[PDB]
Amino acid sequence: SIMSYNGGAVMAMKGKNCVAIAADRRFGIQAQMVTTDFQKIFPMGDRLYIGLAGLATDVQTVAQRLKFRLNLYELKEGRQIKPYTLMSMVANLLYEKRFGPYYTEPVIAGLDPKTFKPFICSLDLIGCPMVTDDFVVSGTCAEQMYGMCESLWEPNMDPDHLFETISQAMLNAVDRDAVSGMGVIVHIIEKDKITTRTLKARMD
Amino acid sequence: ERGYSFSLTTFSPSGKLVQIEYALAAVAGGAPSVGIKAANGVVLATEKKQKSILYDERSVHKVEPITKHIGLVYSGMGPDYRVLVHRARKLAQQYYLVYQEPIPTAQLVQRVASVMQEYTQSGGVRPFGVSLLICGWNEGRPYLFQSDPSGAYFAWKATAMGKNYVNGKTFLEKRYNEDLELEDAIHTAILTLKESFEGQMTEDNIEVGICNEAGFRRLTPTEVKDYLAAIA
Amino acid sequence: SSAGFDRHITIFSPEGRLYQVEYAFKAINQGGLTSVAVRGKDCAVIVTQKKVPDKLLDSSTVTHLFKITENIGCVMTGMTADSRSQVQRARYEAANWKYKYGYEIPVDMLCKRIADISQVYTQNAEMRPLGCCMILIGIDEEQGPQVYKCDPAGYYCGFKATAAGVKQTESTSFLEKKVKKKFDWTFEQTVETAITCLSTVLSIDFKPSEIEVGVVTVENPKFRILTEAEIDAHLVALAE
Amino acid sequence: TTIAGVVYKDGIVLGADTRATEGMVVADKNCSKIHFISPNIYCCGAGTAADTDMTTQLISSNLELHSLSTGRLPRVVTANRMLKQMLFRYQGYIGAALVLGGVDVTGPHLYSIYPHGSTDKLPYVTMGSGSLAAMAVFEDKFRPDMEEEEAKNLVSEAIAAGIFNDLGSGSNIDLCVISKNKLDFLRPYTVPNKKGTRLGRYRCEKGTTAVLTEKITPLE
Amino acid sequence: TGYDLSASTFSPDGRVFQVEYAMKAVENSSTAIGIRCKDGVVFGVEKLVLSKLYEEGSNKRLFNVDRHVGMAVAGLLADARSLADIAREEASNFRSNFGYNIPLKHLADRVAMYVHAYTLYSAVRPFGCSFMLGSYSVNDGAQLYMIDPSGVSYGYWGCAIGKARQAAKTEIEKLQMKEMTCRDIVKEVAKIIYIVHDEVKDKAFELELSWVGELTNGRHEIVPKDIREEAEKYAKESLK
Amino acid sequence: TTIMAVQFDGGVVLGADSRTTTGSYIANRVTDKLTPIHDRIFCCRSGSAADTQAVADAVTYQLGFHSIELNEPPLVHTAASLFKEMCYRYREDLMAGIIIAGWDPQEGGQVYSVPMGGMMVRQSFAIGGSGSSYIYGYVDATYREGMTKEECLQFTANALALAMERDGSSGGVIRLAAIAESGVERQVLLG
After folding, report:
1. In chain A, where the domains are located
2. Which residues of F are catalytic?
3. Rounded to whole angstroms, how far apart are CA atoms F19 and F1?
4. Superfamily assignment of B1-232 in CATH?
5. Residues B131, B167: contact at Cβ < 8 Å?
């Protein structure tokens, strides 16, 4: 697909009091990879990231446009943004190109700014949001990560088993995948700190 | 029209803007009002005396909600007041379109004051002789914002605008304090409004709106006559 | 207190005035015309005289009672051009309401839109502020009959005993002395009080060929202009 | 997606099934498709979900504006006129299958909206992909002026038949009750399908995965 | 004095002097009368030859707007030409948009609103024109309207525009207008124009008579006045 | 689908079926195919539903506005002209099967036809809809000039009956309209 023009896979997963987001490192054209350090996970303020997958043009574009609007909002109001507001903003920004659409599947993961309430959601390429409580996936490979997360997820998870669960899920579902691989980056965050680990993925 | 497009408001040798000062004087020659921010809610109250015994008190309403949780009163001229009310309505609903969340009162005052400031500078139009008193209970803490024809704005614990507003203000400073309830704020607001109004004050001379954390509320003359029937 | 050019355009004066609009509140007074509205119960009555000294001039096309919509009538004073332009704008916004919102426009919203257009003319300079006054009447469900008045300034209001034109300080004095006794208004009461209050103002006590009577009732919500015969019937019915 | 409407002797009962699929995969198991408009009027959506959501939020903004301007309860016909006018401006590009219901002063009024802009008033409608099963249950067992429990049971049975035909939902079908005074709204109405408890479990260990570069960054 | 400059301002007593000055511009223009019979409307314009340099049949103030409507202007001639072009355009629009003849009431109201729009702002001046509008339709009868420079448009049986505004309508009203067909009204208008101002201020004038009605089957054109020659053989019998 | 208007001496008689179909599935079993615009003027529509609804609403707007500004009852030919202009100007996107009928104070009953092209003609009787061809087969056989009202009602009854019986897209229920000087009399033949 045109979504499979540059590969890509973003997994988010809600734990007990914490949220884990991961993506793949590979970038390249249809059969030819180029680099192993492409960025798809972006920090939008504190304890709140976003992931973008699909066409890398729209990835970097919408990342910059959302950063533009986010810094405008965060300077117009002294508080930091709430995740539902970010979801609505992404929905509006995608829906403005109702017929000129960006080819991306944004995934938002952030905690509550006031409490330690987690939040995950995902959208369509036209702006259909969807909040769940277990996991949201995007990118080219879907059914792989669906089967793995419906196989491995438990509701109430400490960050350690959360990390291991999302690690095994991403690794196996990527190793089965063809156009998306070449290293995995993992962001496992909580109220207290931000952890970023990288896995020894199969480079095949 | 032709689109002549020049502004009538230019600087004095003193550096003043005499049209804006005249507009403020025209505000000050208007109907009194009182607005008090209590510890849990905010009380708005105006003073509405009909010219004859022929007028009805069921058609024109001074106290006005902008959202379900943001009240808004004025002291000035209704024909300008309705215009900027409608502008604020459309503006707030554009915000609720974009963000899917109720607009905060500070954001209202930013945008409305920017529009009003734009009318102060743009071509040929007079400024609007209206002093707002915007309020609402957004995120627990309630707020109270006064604006003016100059496009500026403030934030008061309690204030007054209209006839003898300085006298009402000096009564407010001695009577009102930092911490009360909505009922005590209503009590002292009716006291400071009845300090300056005419002698015949009824359930229809005044119009009172409160601001719970449950939302904006516009009281009825039923509970006004429950309360303002010789509240002290 | 003529500072700047406050005698010419819509700017603020010293001390809080602006003279162009409060010159327009006597722009009604060159009409030489008088209008009275009455709402006591579930009917609503307009009455307004003509002044035709000519035999060459018609009588049908001289009426100021203007059917805005099927349930909304109005009467005009002041100068004729501003009145008729306001009339077309009112009809146009009524049809726009019916197209956008799917149902019949209430007289309240329409008078509010008219007042807003009055402000729009008031706001910019180099624009003449339309010296006509508009009284509207109509029936609304769950509220009955309604009476509204529209100023040139854009200050509308809605109230029971209503009169604007030339001589209405006296008319409102009569209506303060009249709408205070708590009698009901059983529609002959309304017509009789309207004709007799205009009779106490002008002191003419005249033929049925001079006043036009606009009525609307909660039995037939259609706007209704009275005929010469029934106007004569009410006139001789109050003739004792 | 199977939304259905009905008019009982006082008001309107709306139900919906909440499996928002993206192609061939169950992408959601809980998707509110019964949208807010007003304190008296709701709406249900079908087809392109994002288009229905954006459109219903725009119309809800417009009616909140109009109602707060007017000072009284809104009318269903106004919402109908706005929706048909907007969808006909978009020339049938926007795919939005809407079911409009509300209680005015005039009473209950149900409308169905087809995304080109054709509108109907009917006492019961079905829209969506599995709409035919609910239409079967209706045309079998509808009678005019039903009771409350009768209408609730009927709409539940209809969307249940829709779920036992293809592209229903796992969900606990959502219902909604609009009456002259009492507005009600029920998300977890009736769960027919319990999740089969895994006798596994696919377990793991805290260290079973090779780590290359860890980083710690504290906060406040 | 000072207020009278702009066309947007009001006076300290409440009127617009621009419109008044425009009204009394037409007062020095030629006298133009018009009267309807029971099956048609008759126009008539006292037209003057300057000294010897005209051609008896140029610059005719009796225009012809629609298939059944024509104007009888007085005042500024080029302004009248522009106004008649506007009326031709409006009737063309109505014919295009509804497929039949424009009614005279709606046409006159569109024209009156156009005139009002030129009276409002300061960007333009008011018109210096005052004109007649005549009609005939089998489902409508004969209709005669009248438009001032301000924009007040209503109906008459007879009218006059010019110097002898009063001095013609003094004896217009003694004409038995209803019981006559227009073929009498031709020589009636002839004797009216001939009576006013025979030789006193000027030396010579000249007569034109427009003619709409049932006798033309709804057409509107000038009479063949030379056919039946009704003025002169009655004019010489009208000096005694 | 199948719509039909017939004038008689006093007034006109209209009529249509109900069923609005999409593909081979019926979305709506019962439908007001004929629409009041003025209180003496109807139109019955066919082709697309949304297009004709929008056009009828716009005609309602302009015609009501114009009729109020006249302060007189409107003509039938005027509304015919309005549908003609709205169809012909912004054609290439519409499917209009519009039939205008109605009583007039000046002209009695008249019936105008506007097909998918945009031409305007005055007829004495008219068909419209996909399943109109068959009863158009015999509406020129059964018709007699100078019928009464009951003859027109029985006439359209038989006509729409056979139209509903033979064509698959038609069916549902019979709705009739009787427009005259006196009033507007609508009734629903079923079963």
Report:
1. 1-204
2. 1
3. 7
4. Aminohydrolase, N-terminal nucleophile (Ntn) domain (3.60.20.10)
5. no
Q: Is F150 helix (H, G, I), strand (E, B) or coil?
A: helix
Which of C103, C109, C141 is closest, CB to CB, to D78?
C103
- Give chain C's radius of gyration (CA, Å): 19
Contact in structure between E30 and E22 (CB atoms under 8 Å): no
**Domain around E24:** 1-240
Beta bridge mates, A27: A35
Angle at C86 between CA C85 and CA C91, to 5 degrees: 100
Query: In this structure, what token pair is assigned to residue B206?
Result: 């005044």
- Substitution target from F65, F66, F70, F71 for chain C, most C beta carbons within 10 A: F65
Nearest CA in chain F to C96: F61
Q: Which two tokens stand for residue A169?
A: 């899920």
**How many CB atoms within 10 Å of residue D196?**
6
Residue with tokens 């995608």: A94
Tell me the pairing of strands A118-122 and C162-165: unpaired
**Total number of domains in chain D:** 1
Give the DSSP letter string of C224-235. EEPPHHHHHHHH
Are D58 and B97 a contacting pair at CB < 8 A? Answer: yes
Q: How many CA atoms lie within 13 A of A170 on its CB side?
A: 37
Question: Which chain D residues are closer than 8 Å to F30 by Cβ?
Answer: 122
Question: Cα–Cα distances in Å, from B197 out to B58, B73, B129, B194, B209?
Answer: 21, 17, 21, 5, 18
Residue D149 CB burial class (10 angstroms; 0-12, 13-18, ≥19): exposed
Say yes or no: domain F1-191 is CATH 3.40.190.10. no
Read off the DSSP letter of residue F47. Answer: B
Question: Nearest CA to CA, how far is B45 from chain D (Å)?
Answer: 20
CB B219 within 8 Å of CB B209: yes
Whole-Å CA distances, F151 to B6, C46, F146: 74, 49, 10
Look at residues E206, E204, E228, E205 and name the one whose alpha carbon lies nearest to residue E215: E228
Residue F103 DSSP symbol = E
Instruction: Identify whether the C-beta of residue C121 lies closer than 8 Å to the C-beta of residue C130.
Output: yes
Residues of chain B contacting C14 with CB distance shorter than 8 Å? 22, 25
Q: Do chains C and E touch (3 or more CB pairs under 8 A)?
A: yes
Name the residue facing A165 among D30, D204, D218 (closest C-beta).
Answer: D204
Q: Could you give the 3-state DSSP secondary structure of residue F128?
A: strand
**Distance from C-alpha of D137 to C-alpha of E239, rounded to nearest angstrom:** 99
User: Edge-to-edge strand order for the sheet containing B64-65?
Assistant: B64-65, B70-73, B133-137, B142-146
In angstroms, what is the resolution? 3.5
Give the single-character DSSP code of E142.
E
Task: Tell me the H-state helices in chain E.
Answer: 17-23, 77-98, 104-120, 165-172, 182-195, 232-235
Q: Tell whether A85 lies on the interface with B, counting CB pairs under 8 A.
A: yes
Task: Kindly tell me the burial class for residue C57, based on how many C-beta atoms sit within 10 Å of its own C-beta (0-12, 13-18, 19 or more).
Answer: middle
Q: What residues of chain C lie within 8 A of the CB of B6, using their CB?
A: none
What end-to-end distance do the CA atoms of chain A give, in Å?
A: 22
C91 Cβ contact partners less than 8 Å away, ≥ 6 residues apart: C68, C69, F65, F68, F69
Q: Which residues of A touch B101 (CB under 8 A)?
A: 82, 84-85, 88
Domains of chain C: 1-240 (3.60.20.10)
> What residues form DSSP beta bridges with D155?
none
Structure tokens at D61: 């903004």
CATH number of the domain at E183, please. Answer: 3.60.20.10
Measure Cα distances from E113 to C33, C81, C84, C214 in Å: 22, 8, 8, 25
Structure tokens that stand for F40 in this block: 């003496």
Contact assignment for E98 to F106 by CB distance below 8 Å: no
Query: Best residue in A85, A114, A121 to probe B by mutation, most B CBs within 10 Å?
Result: A85
Longest distance between any two alpha carbons in chain A, whole Å: 48
